[PDB]
A paper describes a structure:
To gain insights into the structural organisation of NdasCDO, we performed helical reconstruction from the cryo electron microscopy data collected from a cryo vitrified grid containing ordered NdasCDO filaments to resolve a 3.0 Å resolution map. The filament was composed of alternating repeating units of homodimers of NdasCDO subunit A (NdasCDO-A) and homodimers of NdasCDO subunit B (NdasCDO-B), such that the interface between the two homodimers constitutes the heterotetrametric form of the molecule representing the biologically relevant asymmetric unit. Continuous filament is formed by shifting the homotetramer along the screw axis with helical rise of 45.45 Å, helical twist of 132.37° and overall helical pitch of 123.6 Å. NdasCDO-A was composed of four anti-parallel beta strands surrounded by five alpha helical elements. Subunit B: NdasCDO-B is an α-helical protein composed of 4 antiparallel helices and, together with the second monomer, forms a dimeric 8-helical bundle structure. The FMN cofactor is covalently attached to Cys121 from subunit A through an 8α-S-cysteinyl linkage and sandwiched between subunits A and B. In comparison, the same residues were observed in NdasCDO including R32, N59 and S145 from NdasCDO-A and E32, P33, Y36, and R40 from NdasCDO-B. Whilst R32 is in close proximity to one of the C2 carbonyl groups from FMN’s isoalloxazine ring, R28, R29 and R181 also participate in polar interactions with the phosphate group of FMN. Together Tyr36-B, Phe39-B and Met77-B could limit access to the substrate binding site and FMN, as the bulky side chains obstruct the active site. The FMN and substrate binding pocket are in a deep cavity, mostly surrounded by positively charged and hydrophobic residues, and further shielded from solvent by Tyr36-B, Phe39-B and Met77-B. The active site of NdasCDO comprises residues from two A subunits and one B subunit, providing functional rationale for its occurrence as a filament.
Here, we determined the structure and mechanism of the cyclodipeptide oxidase from the halophile Nocardiopsis dassonvillei (NdasCDO), a component of the biosynthetic pathway for nocazine natural products. We demonstrated that NdasCDO forms filaments in solution, with a covalently bound flavin mononucleotide (FMN) cofactor at the interface between three distinct subunits. The enzyme exhibits promiscuity, processing various cyclic dipeptides as substrates in a distributive manner. CDOs enable the facile incorporation of a Cα-Cβ double bond into the 2,5-diketopiperazine backbone.
Author numbering:
A (entry chain B): 14 to 102, 115 to 196
B (entry chain D), D (entry chain C), E (entry chain F), F (entry chain E): 7 to 105
C (entry chain A): 14 to 104, 115 to 195
C-alpha cells in the first residue's frame, strides 16, 4: 500500500541515464523481465504498432556502436525500437514506441541495470545491420547494461518554469 | 595483435564518419563534444597497445568523467585548453613519443 | 533485492489505461509526487524542452473534454504535455519523444498511488491551445486524463511476443 | 610495429582535441569537415596495419580528394552519407571484422 | 435545470464537431466508434433529466463497457444492431416518447 | 420543458446509433458528414433551451447550408477547423459555459 507506492516512486525518480557499462553480460533470465515490462506499454489503438530488436552478439554490438554516435561505451545489450508503418493508424503512434522505451529504462532500473536511449544515429547503416524490412523504421537505440560508475542527477530547471497550474505562466 | 588494432581503427573511422554526417543536424555545440568523444575513444585504443604514460591515463579518466558522466554545467573554453595542454606536455616527453 | 525487483516489475507490468474515472478529486498531495516523478524523464540534451499544464478546474476540464474526443469520461485532473520549440535540438523533433517519455513516467506515477489514465493524444490542437493559453512556441502533444479509477482493470489482447521482438536480427 | 601504431594514435588524439577546441572559433560547417579529416587520418593509420580492402583504398582516396587539394563546393550531406555508407559495406565483410 | 441541460448540449455539439474534424485523419473504423461514443454521452445526459426506463439504463451500461473498457476484439455489425434494436423497442413504448 | 428536451435527446441518441451502424456501409467521407449533421441537430435542441448567443445562430445556419444545401464542392478540413474555432470562442464566453 503506502510502502509499495513509496518504493515504486523511489524507483521511478532515481532513474538515471547510464553511459558507462561494465564488461559483464546481460543474462537471459535478467533480460526476460525487462522485455515483458517494455512490451507492457500503451499503443495508439491496441495495434502494437512497433518492432523491437535485442542485439547481444559482440560483433553486432560493436558495429551498432560504431554506426550510432549516440552510444558512448560498448553496451552488453542493445534494444532497437522501430515504428511499424504497416500497422500505423510524423505519426501519433511513434510516441507510443518511445513510451515503451521509457518503460524499458525503468525496467532496467528495476533489475539494477541502466539504459541510455539515443536518437542521434544513421538510420541507413543501422537499419542495414539490424536487417529491418522496408516498413519498419528505427527510431531509438537503447544501450543497456550493468552500471559501472555511480549515477548522479543532471541539472534540472525549476518546477515553476516547466509546470504550470490550469493555465500558462501560473505557479 | 596488429590486425585487432586495425579492425578497431575501421570501426573508429566509421564512428567519425557517422559523427560528421550527424553534425549537420546536431546543435552548434556538438562539434567539440564529438571530437572529445573520439579523442577518448582513440586514447582508450592507444592505451591498449601504444605507449603507456600515467598522465595519459589521467587524460582518459577526465574525458570519461566529462562524457560518460552527467551532462550539463560544462565549460568548453577552459576544459579543452587544459586537456590539450596536458596531452601536449605528455607528447613533449621524448619517451612517450618517438622522433 | 529480488522482492523489490519483483514489486517494481509488477507495478510496471500491471499498468492498464483507465477511461472510467470516479467522483474523487485528485488532491494536491496526490499530485506533487506525481509531477515530481514525472519530470524525472530523459531529455534530449537535458534541454528539458517541454511544458506541462495541470488542469483541475471543473469548467476547464469540461471545456478540454468537449474539444478533445480522446477523453471518454470527465477526469478529475488533466496533464497537458507539450513540446518546447524554444529549446529544440538542431533548430519532427527527437525531443517530442522525450515529452512522450515523461508522459509514460506520468502514467506510472498515477498507477503507483492508485490513480490511472491514458495517454490521450487525439484532440483538436487549435482549440485546446486557445483554451490552455499556450504561446506560439509550445506545441501540444498529449492530453493525459489522470483520475481515480472506477472500473476494475481489464487486460487487453496483445500480439505474440515472437512477432514483436527478435534477437539481433529480424525473424530470428 | 604496434608501438609505432600507438604513438601515431596519440598524435591523432592530440589532433582531435585541438580540432575540438578550435571548432568553437571556426564556423558550424567546419565540424563535419574536421570529423571527415579525422576519418581519413584514421584510415591512413589503418591502411598499413589494418585489413586491406580495395573499397577502403577507394574511400581513403575519396576523402583525400575532398579535404586535400581544392576547397569549396563539396556538399556535405550527400557526400558524408555516401562515404559512410560505403564504409558500412566494408565493415560488414567477415574478413574485415572478425568479432 | 433547463439551462444546465442546454449548456451540456453546447459542449456535446463541440465534441461532435471535433469528432467530425478528427475523422478526416482517423482510421476507417472510427466513423462508428465516435457515433457510439456520442450516443452514450447523449444517453447519460438524457437519463439525468429525460424519461427514465430500465432498458435505457441497460443500453448506457453496454455502451460504457464497449468504450470505457478494453479496446479490441469488438465486432460492430452485430453489436450495433442489437443496441439500435433495443433502443428502437424502448422508443416504440408510448410512454417513453410523446406523440 | 425539461421533459420534452429529454425525449428529443432519446431520438437524437437513436439517430447516433443508426448513423454509426450505417457508416460501415457508407464510405469513409460520410463519417465527418454524419458528425456534422449531428452537430446541427444538437444545436437545434439547444436553440430554444440553451444559452442564446448570436454566434450560435450564425453557426447553426452554417451547418444548415452545408447539410440541407446542395451536395459536393465542400472542403471539409478547412470548413471543420473554421467552424470548431468559432464555437470555441463561443464556449470561452463566461455566459455560454459557466463551469
Ligand atoms: C529523450 C532522449 C534522450 C536521450 C537522447 C535522445 C532522446 C530523444 N539521446 C541521448 C544521447 O545521445 N546520449 C545520452 O547520453 N543520452 C541521451 N538521452 C538521454 C538524456 O539525454 C538523459 O537522460 C538526460 O541527461 C537526463 O538525465 P536523467 O538522469 O535526469 O534522466
Ligand atoms: C501512445 C498513445 C496512446 C493513446 C493515444 C495516443 C498515443 C500516442 N490516444 C488515445 C486516445 O485518444 N484515446 C484513448 O482512449 N486512448 C489513447 N491512447 C491509449 C491507448 O488507447 C491504450 O494504449 C490502449 O487502448 C490499451 O493499452 P493497454 O496497455 O492498457 O493494454
Amino acid at each position: 500500500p503506502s510502502q509499495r507506492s513509496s518504493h515504486a516512486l523511489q524507483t521511478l525518480t532515481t532513474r538515471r541515464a547510464v553511459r558507462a557499462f561494465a564488461d559483464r553480460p546481460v543474462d537471459d533470465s535478467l533480460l526476460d523481465p525487462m522485455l515483458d515490462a517494455m512490451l507492457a506499454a500503451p499503443s495508439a489503438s491496441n495495434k502494437q504498432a512497433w518492432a523491437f530488436v535485442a542485439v547481444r552478439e559482440r560483433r553486432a554490438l560493436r558495429l551498432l556502436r560504431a554506426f550510432s554516435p549516440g552510444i558512448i561505451e560498448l553496451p552488453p545489450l542493445v534494444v532497437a525500437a522501430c515504428f511499424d508503418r504497416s500497422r500505423a493508424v510524423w505519426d501519433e503512434g511513434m510516441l507510443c514506441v518511445a513510451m515503451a522505451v521509457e518503460n524499458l529504462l525503468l525496467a532496467a532500473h528495476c533489475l539494477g541495470l541502466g539504459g541510455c536511449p539515443s536518437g542521434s544515429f544513421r538510420r541507413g547503416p543501422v537499419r542495414r545491420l539490424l536487417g529491418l524490412p522496408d516498413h519498419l523504421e528505427p527510431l531509438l537505440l537503447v544501450p543497456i547494461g550493468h552500471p559501472a560508475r555511480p549515477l548522479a542527477p543532471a541539472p534540472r530547471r525549476d518546477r515553476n518554469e516547466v509546470v504550470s497550474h490550469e493555465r500558462w505562466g501560473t505557479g | 595483435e596488429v590486425r585487432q588494432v586495425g579492425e578497431e581503427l575501421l570501426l573508429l573511422a566509421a564512428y567519425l564518419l557517422s559523427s560528421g554526417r550527424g553534425l549537420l543536424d546536431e546543435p552548434r555545440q556538438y562539434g567539440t563534444f564529438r571530437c572529445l568523444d573520439a579523442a577518448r575513444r582513440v586514447l582508450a585504443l592507444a592505451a591498449g597497445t601504444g605507449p603507456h604514460h600515467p598522465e595519459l591515463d589521467a587524460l582518459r579518466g577526465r574525458m570519461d568523467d566529462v562524457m560518460c558522466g552527467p551532462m550539463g554545467d560544462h565549460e568548453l573554453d577552459t576544459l579543452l585548453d587544459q586537456m590539450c595542454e596536458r596531452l601536449a606536455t605528455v607528447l613533449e616527453d621524448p619517451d612517450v613519443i618517438s622522433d
